[PDB]
């Protein structure tokens, strides 16, 4: 997308979201990132939404095929699961490449740095979901380290009701439960996150209250499932 204006890439990413063309959206935001300028709050959301949708569809397909493959155990089901798995890994590597070159190192504000580190944890978590071989433990630790650095910054620099801080804790708790085989850590994190946000709600406007309580409900939904 080197020949398109940055502002045109951003405008087309918003159009692609409206058209539910998330592969296009991701390619447009990849091009915008590669212009080399930092991303605004809205632009970070566009980047995240685009790739979350793309990899979300790949993960859903991988799970369908992995389930069929397990029930069977010719080569076709394994081959096609491997094909989807390789395409998912390629998308995850692309996102992680954008974060590493050079979104994270140029992110100085707490809101941008935590946002990108949460992203890094998420895409290593997606890699961990399909990993089996010599690198599954290293992939898991890469997810944990990214989430942990984001947690440390968010606790120092953001209020307990901040939606990015809340969504980071939500996803780190899912990491603990689904990936790290640490369900007690998952439950403790979700509960402490929920309780500290509840005690901070009194400080918020009506619109901020709606933003925070929406993510608190996701924490509560998981706790209900886990306890």
């Amino acid at each position: 997308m080197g020949s398109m204006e940055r502002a045109s890439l951003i405008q087309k990413a918003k159009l692609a979201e409206q058209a539910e063309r998330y592969e296009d959206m991701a390619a447009f935001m990849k091009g915008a990132v590669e212009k080399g300028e930092e991303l605004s709050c809205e632009e970070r959301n566009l980047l995240s939404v685009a790739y979350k949708n793309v990899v979300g569809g790949q993960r859903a397909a991988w799970r369908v095929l992995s389930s069929i493959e397990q029930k069977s155990n010719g080569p076709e089901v394994r081959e096609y699961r491997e094909k989807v798995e390789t395409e998912l890994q390629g998308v995850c590597d692309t996102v992680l490449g954008l974060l590493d070159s050079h979104l994270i190192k140029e992110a100085g504000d707490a809101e941008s740095r935590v946002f990108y580190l949460k992203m890094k944890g998420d895409y290593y978590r997606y890699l961990a979901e399909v990993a089996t071989g010599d690198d599954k433990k290293r992939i898991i630790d890469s997810a944990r380290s990214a989430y942990q650095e984001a947690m440390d910054i968010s606790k120092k620099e953001m209020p307990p009701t901040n939606p990015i801080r809340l969504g980071l804790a939500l996803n780190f708790s899912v990491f603990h439960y689904e990936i790290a085989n640490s369900p007690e850590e998952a439950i403790s994190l979700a509960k402490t996150t929920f309780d500290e946000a509840m005690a901070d709600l009194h400080t918020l406007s009506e619109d901020s209250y709606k933003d925070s309580t929406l993510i608190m409900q996701l924490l509560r939904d998981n706790l209900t499932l886990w306890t």
Partner: peptide, 9 residues
């Protein structure tokens, strides 16, 4: 277990 849906913005 639900992560951030993060599919709309």
């Amino acid at each position: 277990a639900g992560s951030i849906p993060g599919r709309r913005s």
